[PDB]
Amino acid sequence: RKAPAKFRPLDYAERHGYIRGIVKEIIHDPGRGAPLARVVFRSPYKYKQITETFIANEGMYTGQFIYAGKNAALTVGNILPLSSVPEGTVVSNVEEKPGDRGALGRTSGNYVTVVGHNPDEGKTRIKLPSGAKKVVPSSSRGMIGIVAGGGRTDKPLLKASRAKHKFAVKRNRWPKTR
């Protein structure tokens, strides 16, 4: 593991318009069932490019342009605030509060379903993959699509070696004694 899989810090660009990034690589994260998308953005204040790691939704490819911000279009790979999405759209890597760079629905094949908006309170209601019903601030960002790598748990592990190789990078207690 090299870098955490977080969104951009919330700044002027996402709070007022949109910014374009380029997907350079799709990489395997050891200990994580989902691929990570390495996306390079521009810095609005300096000449150097900023390289970032996202959680890759299904259908992304290398060389794809994604758009993150308030006014970005509704396309797979775009990062949008929940105020900018309609009813029934599911998003991934949802922020609990604006600025924590995403906390909800990060696992492969999972998504968070925006079930409602309350514009008077500036809030939104969402449905979690566990079936829980939650209220989050509507300025929290969400990333369009469902997380790539779905169907991972359908295949049986079938071997103690494969379970060992699964948990040896995940640090979980294995083998488990009664």
Partner RNA sequence: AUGGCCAGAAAGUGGUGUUGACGCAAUGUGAUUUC
Partner RNA sequence: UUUUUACUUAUUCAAUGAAGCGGGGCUGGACUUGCGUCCAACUUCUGGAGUUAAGGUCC
In 3D space, the residue among 160, 147, 79, 155 whose CA is nearest the CA of residue 110 turns out to be 147
At closest approach, how far in Å is the CB of 88 from RNA? Answer: 18
In the complex, which residues of this chain contact RNA (CB under 7 A)? 1-6, 9-13, 15-20, 22, 24-25, 31-33, 42-47, 62-65, 67, 69-73, 75, 78, 96, 99-100, 103-110, 128-130, 132, 134, 149-153, 170-173, 176, 178
103 binds, among RNA, another protein, none (CB under 5 to 8 A by kind): RNA
Q: Pick what 116 binds: RNA, another protein, none; C-beta below 5 to 8 Å, kind-dependent.
A: none
The answer to whether 93 is annotated as binding is no
Pick the closer one to RNA by CB: 62 or 116.
Answer: 62
97-136 positions binding another protein, by CB under 8 A: none
Strand bridging mode 133-137 / 90-92: unpaired
| Site for another protein contains 17 (CB under 8 A) | yes
As a whole number of angstroms, the distance between CA 121 and CA 118 comes to 6
How far apart (Å, rounded) are the C-alpha atoms in residues 93 and 56?
A: 10
Q: How many residues bind to another protein according to rule CB under 8 A?
A: 14
User: Following DSSP, what letter does each residue of 106-149 receive, concatenated?
Assistant: -STT--EEEEEEETTTTEEEEE-TTS-EEEEETTSEEEES-BS-
* Buried/exposed code over 79-108 (b: 16+ C-beta within 10 A; e: otherwise): bbbbbbbeeebbbbbbbeebeeebebbbbb
Report in angstroms how near the CB of residue 19 gets to another protein at its nearest: 6
Annotated binding-site positions for Mg(2+) = 172
Please report, as ranges, the residues that interact with another protein according to CB under 8 A.
12-13, 16-20, 42-47, 69
